[PDB]
Structures are given as C-alpha cells and as structure tokens.
Design a protein around this ligand. Structure first.
Ligand SMILES: Nc1ncnc2c1ncn2[C@@H]1O[C@H](COP(=O)(O)OP(=O)(O)O)[C@@H](O)[C@H]1O
Ligand SMILES: CN(CC(=O)O)C(N)N
Ligand SMILES: [Mg+2]
Length: 356
C-alpha cells in the first residue's frame, strides 16, 4: 500500500482509540495486532484497509463501521472481518460455515397479532450480489449502468403477482422520490455511512426501483447491494409476505448468477448482511414497553432482535412505531432467521400485554 494510505490508516486508528464514547464493532475489534497484521495488504482490485474502514473512522456513531470493497476483502482483511462477523451474528467461529439455503416449512409460521392491536406492517428482504462485479466502491459508472440494464431486463420477465415496472431514480421528480421514501418503499438518498464508504459515486446513475403495481414486491437496484429483493404489505401476515419473497428469489436465482461463498453464504457489501442476507421486520407499536428507545432495545436484544426508527436505521420512532427485526443473518438458515423475528415479536407482545 502507498505511504499516503498508510498515514491515513494510522490517523484513523488513533482517532478510533481516542474516541472513548465510540461503541462501534470497528473500534472494538481493530486492535493494534489486527491492524498491524493487515494494514499493508491490498486485494487484486486495489482495495486496501482504508477502503474497508473509512466509513467507520469518519462516522464514529457507526454500529459496525466496515464494508467489503470487493469479495476478496473478506479474506484479505479476515483478521478484522472475522471477529466483527462473529460478534454481530451472535457466534460464527473460524471453523463455521453458513448452512445450506433452507426456506423451511412455511405452514409452520404462527398467526401473529390477530386483533391488529400492535403490528402496522410486515416486510422481509434479502440482498444479492451479481457474480462478476465487485461491490460499490470498486464499480465504474459504466458497470453501474450495465448492471442496471441486466437486472431490469431480468425483472421484465417476472409474471403474475410479481409482474412489474422499473423506475430509474433519475427520472423521478423530487416529489415522486419523496413519496416513495415516505411510504417506506424506496431507499433514501444521501446516507452518510454509505457516502464515506465510497458507495454513492455517480449517484443516481444505475440506481432505481422495480415494483409490481401493488408495491408488495420490490427490487432495489444498486443501492447498498446490487439487489435488494423485498416483499412487504400492511398488517401482520408474515406467512404471505415470506412466501412471496421465497417465490421471487427462487425465480430470480434461475435467471441471474449471484455470488455465494462456501463459508459466508450469499455475499453482500456489509458483513451484517451475509449468509441468508435476510431482514424480516415489523413496524409495531408497543407503548408500555417503548416508553424509551433504550429500554425497548435492551428487551429486544435478549431475543436477538434489533430496533430501528420508522424510516429505517439511523432514524427515530414516529408516533411510537418501531421497526423491529431479526439481527442475525449468518450461521442460521432462512427459516431460522424469519423464526427469530416471529418468535421474538410473539414474546414482546406477551410482555407488552403483561406490562403495567
Ligand atoms: N416492516 C416494515 N414495514 C414498512 N416499512 C418498513 C418495514 N421495515 C422496514 N421498512 C422500510 O424499509 C426502508 C429501508 O430501511 P432500512 O433500515 O434501510 O432497511 P434495509 O435493511 O431494507 O436497507 C425504510 O423506508 C423503512 O421504513
Ligand atoms: C448500517 N448498516 C449496518 C452495518 O453497517 O453493519 C448497514 N447498512 N448494513
Ligand atoms: Mg438500508
């Protein structure tokens, strides 16, 4: 690695060490030994440790703080990725491998909140990376557009409930984009964490959203991951939402080659999204338990759940509505990830009813 890069790494390391109140996984795991063992390494595409950690050095409030610029990074900088992955996913040993894909028996899911007293809406998404392309920081504008054409072409073959239309982000008026974000369908722009990871270059070229007219099946193109495949609807019918995602992912997989790793499962830009890449969530109101952000988070962590704001991560709850989802994605099956969300929510509803 060039000397300028080395100097920036040293400054980054010092900045992390000195931030006493920083709680990121990056600060916790980038010890002097780990740092010294990988700071001189570079992947075949030229990715360095600075490309990996810059977003977390610049944003000390990061929960994790690292990203993979390319697939090789996961191993080149394994001394840093491995402990962070183990910590975030609730145990992932050096000898563990992500289990084979398994959606599970959908009929076993339990009807949530039948009276409709708590759950506002349900969503399950997965992420996929196209084989043959690196992650955001290493893409050219030309690649972004080539990928956009490939994905939008494949999606034009979706049928029946999944049939839809592609909407390029350029092309959207300010009001059109705002409404789709306000309604929780479209990804927001200007995320400081992604920007500093060099993940928003050439914005909005190559970015956009595919969705069926009902907006129950959507695919984000070129935001954090190459693809985010999403199933969502109002209410609490997790079974229907999950079945639709399964159907969509099985179909798209037959049409587009995605990157998969024997140890990490499906590859993604952020290590928190490896493995199943699955985030099953509900927008839910638990007034007696959500009397405080922190108290709700501490209850949720006991069930391997994470709490986000109404407009997603790094936002606040509005009107008492929180996004609660399974935290873990690697080292457990797809069925198990959706079950951790379902089981935890079932328990949190029991706790809310008994609270007083
Ligand atoms: N259960 C849900 N119902 C409605 N919208 C949701 C739900 N879960 C997440 N969202 C929306 O998904 C969008 C992306 O939020 P984010 O936290 O970035 O999640 P992701 O993991 O999908 O990138 C935001 O508009 C957020 O409000
Ligand atoms: C903020 N995230 C969590 C993380 O970086 O681990 C995202 N984008 N996955
Ligand atoms: Mg997001």
């Amino acid at each position: 690695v060039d000397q300028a890069t080395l100097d920036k790494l040293e400054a980054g390391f010092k900045k992390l060490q000195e931030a006493s109140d920083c709680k990121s996984l990056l600060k916790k795991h980038l010890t002097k030994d780990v740092f010294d063992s990988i700071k001189n390494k570079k992947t075949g595409m030229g990715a360095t440790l600075l490309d990996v950690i810059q977003s977390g050095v610049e944003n000390l409030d990061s929960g994790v703080g690292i990203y993979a610029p390319d697939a090789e990074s996961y191993r080149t900088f394994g001394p840093l990725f491995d402990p962070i992955i183990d910590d975030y996913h609730g145990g992932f040993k050096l000898t563990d491998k992500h289990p084979p894909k398994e959606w599970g028996d959908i009929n076993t899911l339990v009807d949530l909140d039948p009276a409709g007293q708590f759950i506002i809406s349900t969503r399950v998404r997965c992420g996929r990376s196209l084989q043959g392309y690196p992650f955001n920081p290493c893409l050219t504008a030309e690649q972004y557009k080539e990928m956009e054409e490939k994905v939008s072409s494949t999606l034009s073959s979706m049928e029946d409930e999944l049939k839809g239309t592609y909407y390029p982000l350029t092309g959207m008026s300010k009001a059109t984009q705002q409404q789709l974000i306000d309604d929780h369908f479209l990804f927001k722009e200007g995320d400081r964490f992604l920007q500093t990871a060099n993940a928003c270059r050439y914005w909005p070229t190559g970015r956009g959203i595919f969705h069926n007219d009902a907006k129950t099946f959507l695919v984000w193109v070129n935001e954090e991951d190459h693809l985010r495949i999403i199933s969502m609807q109002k209410g609490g019918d997790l079974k229907t939402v999950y079945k639709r995602l399964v159907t969509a992912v099985d179909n798209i997989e037959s049409k587009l080659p995605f990157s998969h790793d024997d140890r990490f499962g499906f590859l993604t830009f952020c290590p928190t999204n490896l493995g199943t890449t699955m985030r099953a969530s509900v927008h839910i109101q638990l007034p007696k338990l959500a009397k405080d952000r922190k108290v709700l988070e501490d209850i949720a962590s006991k069930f391997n759940l994470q709490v986000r704001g109404t407009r997603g991560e790094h936002t606040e709850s509005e009107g008492g509505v929180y996004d609660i989802s399974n935290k873990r994605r690697l080292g457990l099956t797809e069925y198990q990830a959706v079950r951790e969300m379902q089981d935890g929510i079932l328990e949190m509803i029991k706790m809310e009813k008994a609270a007083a």
